[PDB]
Ligand binder design. Structure first.
Ligand SMILES: *[C@@H]1O[C@H](CO)[C@@H](O[C@@H]2O[C@H](CO)[C@@H](O[C@@H]3O[C@H](CO)[C@@H](O)[C@H](O)[C@@H]3O)[C@H](O)[C@H]2NC(C)=O)[C@H](O)[C@H]1NC(C)=O
Ligand SMILES: *[C@@H]1O[C@H](CO)[C@@H](O[C@@H]2O[C@H](CO)[C@@H](O[C@@H]3O[C@H](CO)[C@@H](O)[C@H](O)[C@@H]3O)[C@H](O)[C@H]2NC(C)=O)[C@H](O)[C@H]1NC(C)=O
Ligand SMILES: *[C@@H]1O[C@H](CO)[C@@H](O[C@@H]2O[C@H](CO)[C@@H](O)[C@H](O)[C@H]2NC(C)=O)[C@H](O)[C@H]1NC(C)=O
Ligand SMILES: *[C@@H]1O[C@H](CO)[C@@H](O[C@@H]2O[C@H](CO)[C@@H](O)[C@H](O)[C@H]2NC(C)=O)[C@H](O)[C@H]1NC(C)=O
Lengths: 75, 493, 75, 75, 75, 49, 49, 49, 98, 49
């Protein structure tokens, strides 16, 4: 494919190993983390957006985590 | 010129009464002295030798055991003594062993046992001391000559050797007059409590009390034929298998455990005469007997050309290397700075007197533009090529970098860093005094606290400071905590 | 692999268009759209989560849209 | 035996980098962490001690963390 | 570096006397005591910390003694 | 690459995951991080290919 | 003009030679002689014997 | 070691901070975690050995 | 008897064949062709380079060093499997005997 | 400070007459003769009042 929609989580799994598990386990996460360490500018805006949206620490945390996670994965 | 881009090089623009400026030049990096109508002097500390060392006490790491002896007594007879126990070369220990008819003793029970062992350590490490009357502080200074072989050269300069015997010395620059160094080596880094710890081929610097508390057997160091070891017992153990008998075993070498035992210690190269580095001394610059190359030259009237491009120096300064193709006589290099959409004069010449020497030497000019976009015109006449450089950053960035540099410099030199620029005296002295008064107690308080523990105690004190209903307690605790965290983030450099 | 993390927003602005502006302008949204059309199950879960965490209307809609964007991209 | 009480904290130094900076700096905490990983039961013991003494919360944290820092180091 | 975390406390032994019994047993406390003798100022610091936190007396003793036991060992 | 060229921001040109080499064109490049390209798959227990 | 080349990457592979080795349980990690060369990549995995 | 033996715990021996080998009685070992036995002094910032 | 070596680990080491390369400050990391060898120890550090070091651009560039490594006097930790134990017990009777 | 000796005088040129003096606690320089070549001795006494 365009390698943007990996064939993952289809549910039709078996005891045997998949094509690539040791790397696909952390591929997307490592992309997000290298993004975040490269560019901290988005973090300030994400913190502000989570903070000034109606704030209960549950809501603030979930909004901040999602907003900091979505932009890197889906640029 | 003697140094560009070293990382800690820092300008000092001081013109005090009688033109003496005090700089405390540390060993890590140089200083640059830009002055008005003076040649900009560049000074870096060179090798700081200290020869003719005195051994003081030495102590051993690997030991060897020979000539085992042993006697025992029946259980109620008391202690046992071997005739060779009084020898200082023998290690002895008393232990209780069960004796009986199988051991040729009529009375059953537990009798005392003792063992001996001749002891001669191998590869003893020796800790020498340096007395003040043999120091070999030397300082090499260079002038910002227009010269192609001067951009970052390390083997061109004038050597000024300043022992504590000759506390103040003057160095004669070849054609720039002379400089008067009024130093004070006696107040530099302490050299009466430090003990050089040369072992194998590597040396070290350690505290006096710490070296006197290393848990290894020592000798006198009287360069005697044979040493007489104190506290031998601590290097050899005596396994007592069950209660039948005991034998002696040495603990091998110790050089690995020693190398681990000193991490915070600074290392020093030692080949023949010791050539220790990393020391710092303060000095006073008598700049009142200087001349600026040739001030009676004429200004150039021909073109210039860039042999090599310009480049920054992570300090906001440029190195422009220019070749003068004009056949005419040696002439002062004209210079002006053209600001963006303006003719204003901003920025100055760090070289301060760029002059061509032989029409074939690409003499190089070093300067800094304003933080905006700049235009550096380099010659007279309409056909004078314009070097354009765009120096990224703003003035406030320079302010923050200066704050960081000042704090880091204070974190090492303590009170001595309080005077690093002009002599001042009207207000600098009082600040130095008060900071010294607080800092002597402070460093006398936390002496011996690690990286993470200093950080932890600082944050604990801060947390205490944010939970008290007292202005005095709150401010004192929070200030101490924040200062402690900042010091811990720089400590163990 | 390297197919992830394009430098779409790298900021080296230019006047002429880039290598693949036409496709890259919409490929990520295309991935999300085809993921949603393939799998309708996540919509119910996202609606449930937003409805039971969102105190207000705007918080609910923001939570729903972020959840519906992150998961197809994180797939 | 000499490895204990390493030469550190004594004030005799400058901006020149000293012996074994990074390794020696992180050595002690790495050893404490690995000892903790070896024996997790003392974590339960320290939690009990912290819970049953202190009569506060910040104090509970102080005794817990510092006590947990002691034993691997006194070992 | 290996001298830290000495093999002790692990349960593998019997009534046969082990390696370096007396010396190894008293080594740690002797080192702590000599470090304390080197730097008496931290005694004043620990007294201040113990006095200003704890809100009791037994707790004051616990933080004081244990804190004083930490630093020579974390050194 | 091949007959085409590009300009990419330098900071982004080391973080894209692929093997890299000194670029000394000495005909025997010892590639750093070879593990990233080659992939091992282990079947259900047993052998490895 | 007058460019300089650094960090040439590699966008293909060709695993030519393959080798393997095993060791019985509780007998340490099985080494392979073709381990210290500047052109071999591999990892250790666990198998049931 | 040398001429004296000792008894140690399994996990403790697997956490001794020294570089290890496999122990496959190979001709030459392949040392894991060598960095922990050798230090790299960086005198100022000029160079390191 | 008949012990199995399992893993061995070394105490004294020796270093030979020093190598080193460096890059201009903005060129990035530096790699030596011998880094992939398991016998070489490598470490990256930042060093300030300039016209005195033969680099056109001033700043801080990366630096790396290598070293061949062959430990001396390696200590080896063997294990004993149960099927080779040699427990022995000597018993005596209370004979009347001198 | 104080010249602890009363008033040192050189009785004869050939062999030195030795002075004794007590400097202040702070780092203080001490001169003897007069002129550019006048011998000057630095000292730093340790302690406070
Ligand atoms: C310590 O132990 C060593 C051995 O472990 C002892 O060395 C032995 O010393 C004796 C007497 O000094 C040596 O005997 C000599 O033999 C020559 C042979 O002709 C004889 O002519 C001499 O009159 C003397 O009896 C013996 O060879 C030597 N053994 C060795 C070196 O292996 C030593 O005496 C013990 N004590 C001390 C204080 O070293
Ligand atoms: C590691 O450093 C050592 C020296 O520290 C290097 O040893 C040197 O290796 C070269 C090539 O193997 C030797 O040159 C040889 O000289 C003979 C003389 O006839 C010549 O016929 C051979 O063709 C070869 O050129 C050199 O003598 C030797 N120097 C010594 C041993 O002191 C070694 O190459 C470096 N690298 C490695 C991987 O060991
Ligand atoms: C530092 O300055 C010295 C002195 O100018 C340079 O040594 C000169 O090198 C040139 C090379 O063309 C020779 O022609 C001169 O004879 C040398 N002069 C001497 C040895 O006194 C040295 O090269 C400079 N450093 C650097 C890195 O260039
Ligand atoms: C690794 O694989 C190569 C792949 O060719 C092998 O080299 C072959 O070895 C056989 C055995 O002697 C020869 O008959 C072939 O002619 C070789 N082919 C080539 C192209 O050289 C070999 O198994 C290994 N090569 C090594 C270890 O150098």
């Amino acid at each position: 494919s365009v390698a943007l929609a990996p064939h993952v989580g289809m549910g039709l799994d078996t005891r045997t190993q998949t094509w690539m598990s040791a790397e696909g386990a952390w591929r997307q996460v490592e992309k997000v983390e290298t993004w975040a360490l490269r560019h901290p500018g988005f973090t300030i805006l994400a913190l502000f957006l989570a903070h000034y949206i109606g704030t209960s620490l549950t809501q603030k945390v979930v909004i901040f985590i999602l907003l900091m996670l979505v932009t890197p994965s889906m640029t | 010129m003697r140094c560009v881009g070293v990382g800690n090089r820092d300008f000092v623009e001081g013109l005090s009464g009688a033109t003496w400026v005090d700089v405390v030049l540390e060993h890590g990096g140089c200083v640059t002295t830009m002055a008005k109508n003076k040649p900009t002097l560049d000074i870096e500390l060179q090798k700081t030798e200290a020869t003719q060392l005195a051994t003081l006490r030495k102590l051993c790491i690997e030991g060897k055991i020979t000539n085992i002896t042993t006697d025992s007594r029946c259980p109620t007879q008391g202690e046992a003594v071997l005739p060779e126990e009084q020898d200082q070369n023998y290690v002895c220990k008393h232990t209780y062993v069960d004796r009986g008819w199988g051991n040729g003793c009529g009375l059953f029970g537990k009798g005392s046992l003792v063992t001996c062992a001749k002891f001669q350590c191998l590869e003893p490490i020796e800790g020498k001391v340096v007395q003040y009357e043999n120091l070999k502080y030397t300082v090499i200074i260079t002038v910002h000559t227009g010269d192609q072989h001067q951009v970052g050269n390390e083997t061109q300069g004038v050597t000024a050797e300043i022992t504590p015997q000759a506390s103040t010395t003057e160095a004669i620059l070849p054609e720039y007059g002379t400089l008067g160094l009024e130093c004070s080596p006696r107040t530099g880094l302490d050299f009466n409590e430090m003990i050089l710890l040369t072992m194998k081929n590597k040396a070290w610097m350690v505290h006096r009390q710490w070296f006197f508390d290393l848990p290894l057997p020592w000798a006198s160091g009287a360069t005697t034929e044979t040493p007489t070891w104190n506290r031998k017992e601590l290097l050899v153990t005596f396994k007592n298998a069950h209660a039948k008998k005991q034998e002696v075993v040495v603990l091998g070498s110790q050089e690995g455990a020693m190398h681990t035992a000193l991490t915070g210690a600074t290392e020093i190269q030692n080949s023949g005469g010791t050539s220790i580095f990393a020391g710092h001394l303060k000095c006073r610059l008598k700049m009142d007997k200087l001349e600026l190359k040739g001030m009676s030259y004429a200004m150039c009237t021909n073109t210039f050309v860039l042999k090599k491009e310009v480049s920054e120096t992570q300090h906001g300064t440029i190195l422009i290397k220019v070749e003068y193709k004009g056949e005419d006589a040696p002439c002062k290099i004209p210079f002006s700075t053209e600001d963006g959409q303006g003719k204003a004069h901003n920025g100055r010449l760090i070289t301060a007197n760029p002059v061509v020497t032989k029409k074939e030497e690409p003499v190089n000019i070093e300067a800094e533009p304003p933080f905006g976009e700049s235009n550096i015109v380099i010659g007279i006449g309409d056909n004078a090529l314009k070097i354009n450089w765009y120096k990224k950053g703003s003035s406030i960035g320079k302010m923050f970098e200066a704050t960081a540099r000042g704090a880091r410099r204070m974190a090492i030199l303590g009170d001595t860093a309080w005077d690093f620029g002009s002599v001042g005296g009207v207000l600098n002295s009082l600040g130095k005094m008060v900071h010294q008064i607080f800092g002597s107690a402070y460093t006398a308080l936390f002496s011996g606290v690690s990286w993470v523990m200093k950080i932890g105690i600082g944050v604990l004190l801060t947390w205490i400071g944010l939970n008290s209903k007292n202005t005095s307690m709150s401010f004192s605790c929070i200030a101490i905590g924040i200062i402690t965290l900042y010091l811990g983030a720089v400590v163990q450099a």
